[PDB]
Amino acid sequence: NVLDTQEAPFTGRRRKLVVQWIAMAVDMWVREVERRMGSWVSELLGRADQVLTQIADAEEIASLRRTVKGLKRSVD
Amino acid sequence: SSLDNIEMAYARQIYIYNEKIVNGHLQPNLVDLCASVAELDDKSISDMWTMVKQMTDVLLTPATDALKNRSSVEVRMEFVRQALAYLEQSYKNYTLVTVFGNLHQAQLGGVPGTYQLVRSFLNIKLPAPLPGLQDGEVEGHPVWALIYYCMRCGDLLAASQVVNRAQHQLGEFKTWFQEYMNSKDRRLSPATENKLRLHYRRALRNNTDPYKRAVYCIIGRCDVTDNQSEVADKTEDYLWLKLNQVCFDPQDRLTLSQFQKQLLEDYGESHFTVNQQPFLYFQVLFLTAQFEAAVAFLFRMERLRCHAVHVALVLFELKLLLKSSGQSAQLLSHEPGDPPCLRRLNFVRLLMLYTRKFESTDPREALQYFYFLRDEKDSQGENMFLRCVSELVIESREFDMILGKLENDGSRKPGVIDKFTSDTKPIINKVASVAENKGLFEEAAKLYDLAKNADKVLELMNKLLSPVVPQISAPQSNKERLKNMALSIAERYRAQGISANKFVDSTFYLLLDLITFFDEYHSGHIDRAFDIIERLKLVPLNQESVEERVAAFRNFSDEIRHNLSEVLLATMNILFTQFKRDRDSQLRSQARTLITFAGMIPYRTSGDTNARLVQMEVLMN
Amino acid sequence: ERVSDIYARLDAVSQQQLKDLTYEQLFSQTPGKELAKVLVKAIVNRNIAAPDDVVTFKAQEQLQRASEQAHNAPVLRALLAESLRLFEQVAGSLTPANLTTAVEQMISLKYYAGAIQLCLTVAQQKDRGNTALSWVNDGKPANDSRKKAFDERKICYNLIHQVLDKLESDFAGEPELVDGRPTLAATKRMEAYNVVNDSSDEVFHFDMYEWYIEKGWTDRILSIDSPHVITYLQRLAETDFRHAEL
């Protein structure tokens, strides 16, 4: 809900941090399922990737895109 | 064991072929590895593999799609030649055993020249002269008989020698035949081919010499409808007669597609299996490039399942078998977006059937056959080989043998699957996952512990311990059998520095301490048991700690809160006993503490427990 | 975890670094951090025997379990398919040691196509700018720093050679057709070589032309059709007799 509305302070290039949060949260989620969610999470991680390209720390973003696309595989 | 003598020998050969690919060695000839067992059986099977080798021994384009090789006119042409070379050589052996009683008998005296053999073959099969022969004889036999059976045996040179000694009698046939022997692909030039066909059709359409008729339209590939039944009375003689008549790019012409389809569509199994001889039909399909049909067909004969599966594998490891994309289709089918003259084999189902027979008590051999499915997946994405190993372990329950037994000393003796892939983390969880879903926690723990997945091992170990925490640990009980495995998991998890998240892990070592608290309590070692509970700082004993201990209970695993009732009572009964034996004030103070704690904690059987706790404190005073 | 089990299966420099490892070094020195990484890496590639460094472990765990199976098309295929899925998500980060072991394990389980697909993916991810294609198109000037980019693709291409090599080896003597339709050994040959001809990696196809030439497969190379191979030869002709003959 935060990544779509883009109400301040969650605007502009600061949304790079919103994706980092989403990566951490979802990553901790699949790691908590594989230790022991649907289309809408895959819809998000892919939509979260548009944000990283729309923002394109040149190497941080690049490394982060490959962490998102890794989670999209883990859910599908 | 569910494997017959023949099937077992094949399994061993398939283990070799797997051992070679598992150690990266040279890809040996599978067809040779299968014919190695065939010689241990009757020649009915040996002569099959001979056909399989010769029909698959065609120059291919490595790393090319299967459908492409089989659609290419290039390859389709060589199939016809490899078959004709088999029908000719096969017939040549029939001609030997016809003259000599045994192949060995012919060999000791020496195989005679194809010419003298054929001559010594005509003596028997026509002892008296037929009155309808033409063009005289040659060294005591009709010239056309010699030419036919020489061409039938495949020795065109031997046939041309016959022609050279009858130059005057045969007329213009010499210059025509000499061209056929020269031109490749057993075809003449359109101009000369036209000259002879029209001559034959002119006044020789019905000649009293059947051998003359046969040779002419074998050379000219004419009169495709006339099966020359006078000379081609056997089935192989028919196949050979037609494969010498097929053509490639409108009247009086037959092509492989028409012939191959014409045979099985109009004259199906029914026509070729009335004599209850199965290989006859198989040879008809295999020597016409219809490998999928012949494989499915022969796979239904319950006595020849082994052979049909392997001839499928050979075609599969040679990029020649046309697999069916969808796994929901029948065993034999024609894809909707493919030409009607080709068929497809549901290879996945094929192996799945063969395996179910001996997968129950012969797992090792089953895996060897499951490996060929390594390159395929299913609709859900799982690797077919990996899934087949999961299902085979769920059913067979052969964990130590197939997955590798992880002893209680910290060793992992590898299993049979370790040979095929080194990434054994998923299936061990797959097998552990279902057994977990079937309430088989004690097994799911051993399995999860085999894959060093402590998050799940300790989780399940928490569930198996909480019920047994206050119970009496007695020889061979369910407590001993679970406590002793938990301790064997505590050592191996400390010596190897392994641990799950602190929530799962903290509870696991906490229960182990409590299990010690009751094992000491039930033994009468009151002093020793009191000391343990004091360390855990789980139950307050001085009024100052009540506030913090009460807050901790809120976030402690319910596997602990469950056993709070028995802990308070044992601890109370401990102080209770020590009282009957200043110190009195100290026990009295601690007695109070337990009550106030229990009063502020909502827990299991708080009613009966809180009452008993208060009574035991009153008797102290 | 099982400690000495790791130790026994270590190097000597790894075994001797752990021997004289102090807590100070672990806490505040690089060699200590490096060894910690080595050790965790070992226990991860054994239960398989940062969402990038986490996924890579699970992938090794999936692949390790696959090899521990009795061969269940459903379970084996699932584990393999997933292992590949995961590895590809972290393709750009894979080290030559992890890639090699993975490919080898997949090769042992007859997962040829899959192995090849991983190698190509890894090659494309370690160089999305195609610095390698331009470095080859520029004659490979020494002292240039695209060599690294080309080397990281060559390690993937070599591993692809091993896959195809082991494929023809594993299926040496196996027939391409049985009873009419194709065998399973044949379909894996087609599925593998499909992945090959389905690629758009150009440095890869150059490396494969060179490879075909090496192995002597005039069979397949003369049958490509494409000009791409002609144009490639037109540059390398005045240079080698064997190429000029092609």
**B611-618 contacts at long range (C-beta below 8 A, 24 or more positions apart):** B612/B569, B612/B572, B613/B568, B613/B569, B613/B572, B616/B572, B616/B573, B616/B576, B616/B591, B617/B572, B617/B588, B617/B591, B617/B592
Q: Phi/psi of residue B413, each to 5°?
A: -70, 115
Measured CA to CA, the distance from residue B14 to residue B26 in angstroms comes to 15
List the structure tokens of B195: 């000259």
What is the helix, strand, coil percentage profile of chain A, to 5? 85, 0, 15
Q: Which residues of A touch B453 (CB under 8 A)?
A: 35
In the stretch 420-459 of chain B, residues with CB closer than 8 A to chain A read 453, 455-456, 459
Transcribe B563-604 into DSSP letters. THHHHHHHHHHHHHHHHH--HHHHHHHHHHHHHHHHHH---T
C51/A69 CB distance under 8 A: no
Work out the angle at residue B596's Cα, subtended by the Cα atoms of residues B594 and B598, and round it to the nearest 5 degrees. 65
C90/A66 CB distance under 8 A: yes
CB atoms closer than 10 angstroms to residue C168: 18
Best CA proximity match to C61, nearest among C96, C30, C101, C32:
C101
CB atoms closer than 10 angstroms to residue B566: 19
End-to-end CA distance of chain C: 59
Q: How many CB pairs under 8 A join B and C?
A: 547
Chains touching A (3+ CB pairs < 8 Å): B, C
Measured CA to CA, the distance from residue B137 to residue A18 in angstroms comes to 100
The amino acid that residue B454 corresponds to is A
Best CA proximity match to A68, nearest among B156, B174, A51, B148:
A51
DSSP-assigned letter for residue B131: T
DSSP-assigned letter for residue B452: T
Best CA proximity match to C82, nearest among A46, B426, B372:
B426
Q: Side-chain half-sphere of B371: how many Cα atoms within 13 Å?
A: 36
Measured CA to CA, the distance from residue B620 to residue B582 in angstroms comes to 14
B347/C114 CB distance under 8 A: no
Whether the CB-CB separation of B363 and C70 falls below 8 Å is answered with yes
Least CA distance to B426: which residue of chain A?
A34
Least CA distance to C91: which residue of chain A?
A66
Question: 3-state class of B138 per DSSP?
Answer: strand
B21 vs C85, C169, C179: nearest CB: C169
Measured CA to CA, the distance from residue B195 to residue B212 in angstroms comes to 17
Transcribe B49-72 into DSSP letters. HHHHHHHH-S---TT--HHHHHH-
Rg, C-alpha atoms of chain B: 41
DSSP H or E segment with residue B137: strand B137-138
Cα distances (Å, whole numbers) of residue B414 to B218, B278, B370, B399, B451 = 63, 44, 19, 11, 12
Best CA proximity match to B371, nearest among B611, B95, B18:
B18
Q: Which residues of C touch A29 (CB under 8 A)?
A: none
Work out the angle at residue C12's Cα, subtended by the Cα atoms of residues C10 and C18, and round it to the nearest 5 degrees. 75
Least CA distance to C125: which residue of chain A?
A66
- The residue to which tokens 């002597």 are assigned: C216
Measured CA to CA, the distance from residue B455 to residue B505 in angstroms comes to 8
Q: Which residues of B touch A31 (CB under 8 A)?
A: none
Show the DSSP H helices in C68-179 as ranges.
73-89, 96-108, 112-125, 131-136, 147-170
Q: Would an 8 Å CB–CB cutoff place A69 in contact with chain C?
A: yes
* C245/chain B closest Cα distance in angstroms: 21
Bridge partners for C178 per DSSP? C181
* Residue A9 preceded by cis peptide, ω within 30: yes
Q: Would an 8 Å CB–CB cutoff place A34 in contact with chain C?
A: yes
Chains touching B (3+ CB pairs < 8 Å): A, C
Which residues, 6+ apart, have CB-to-CB distance to C131 below 8 Å?
A: C146, C149, C150
Question: CB burial class (10 A; 0-12, 13-18, 19+) of residue A38?
Answer: exposed
- Which residue of C98, C187, C188, C219 to mutate against B (max B Cβ within 10 Å)? C187
Reduced 3-state DSSP string for B237-306: HHHHHHHCCEECCCCCCEEHHHHHHHHHHHCCHHHHCCCCCHHHHHHHHHCCCCHHHHHHHHHHCCCCHH
Buried b (16+ CB within 10 A) or exposed e, C202-215: ebbbbbbbebbbee
* A29/chain C closest Cα distance in angstroms: 11
Best CA proximity match to C197, nearest among C118, C92, C120:
C120
Buried b (16+ CB within 10 A) or exposed e, B319-353: bbbbbbeebebebbbbbeeeeeebbbbbbbebbbe
C187 vs B289, B316, B392: nearest CB: B316
Whether the CB-CB separation of C133 and C205 falls below 8 Å is answered with no
Q: Which residues of B touch A36 (CB under 8 A)?
A: 455-456, 459
A70/C89 CB distance under 8 A: yes
Whether the CB-CB separation of B153 and B146 falls below 8 Å is answered with no
* B479/chain A closest Cα distance in angstroms: 25
Q: Which residues of C touch B66 (CB under 8 A)?
A: 176, 182, 186-187, 189-190
Measured CA to CA, the distance from residue C158 to residue C104 in angstroms comes to 12
DSSP-assigned letter for residue B227: -
Least CA distance to C57: which residue of chain A?
A31
| Residues recorded for chain B | 621
The amino acid that residue C7 corresponds to is Y
Q: Which residues of C touch B498 (CB under 8 A)?
A: 1-2, 43
Counting DSSP H helices and E strands in chain B, the numbers are: 34, 6
Question: CB burial class (10 A; 0-12, 13-18, 19+) of residue B85?
Answer: middle
Measured CA to CA, the distance from residue B368 to residue B21 in angstroms comes to 11
Question: 3-state class of B323 per DSSP?
Answer: strand
CB atoms closer than 10 angstroms to residue C67: 33
Best CA proximity match to C62, nearest among A34, B261, A33:
A34
Show the DSSP H helices in B359-477 as ranges.
363-370, 384-396, 399, 425-437, 441-450, 454-465
Question: 3-state class of B412 per DSSP?
Answer: strand
Best CA proximity match to B228, nearest among B574, A26, B250, B220:
B220
DSSP H or E segment with residue C177: strand C177-178
List the structure tokens of B354: 């063969």
Q: Which residues of A touch B455 (CB under 8 A)?
A: 35-36
